[PDB]
Amino acid sequence: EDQEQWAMQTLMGSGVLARCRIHNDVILDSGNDASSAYKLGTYLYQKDNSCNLFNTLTEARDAIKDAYESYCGIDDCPQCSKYIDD
């Protein structure tokens, strides 16, 4: 398992993104307030780490920005569209 993926749990679970009940390891783009997601991400990731260049929030933003941009272009899991929905 991946840690960064664990973050997505709550971060993304904040309702920012969309996930399939059959796919908990999948990320779908919703187009909701990402700002909130980012905050939620930093919140879970670690308390207020607001410090000098030392700590860079860009990492987190890139984490979600990466995952988001990674799955970006998908508003619905193709699996369900590639399979039958019991």
Of 86, 78, 83, whose CA–CA distance to 26 is shortest? 78
Closest separation in Å from C-beta 77 to Zn ion: 4
Spatial separation of the C-alpha atoms in residues 66 and 13, rounded to whole Å: 17
Residues 6+ apart with CB under 8 A from 29: 17, 18, 68, 71, 72, 73, 74, 75
Scan residues 64-83 and list those touching Zn ion (CB under 5 A).
77, 79-80
Scan residues 18-57 and list those touching Zn ion (CB under 5 A).
20, 22-23
Nearer to Zn ion by C-beta: 24 or 36?
24
- How many residues at the interface with Zn ion, by CB under 5 A? 6
Residues at the interface with Zn ion (CB under 5 A) = 20, 22-23, 77, 79-80
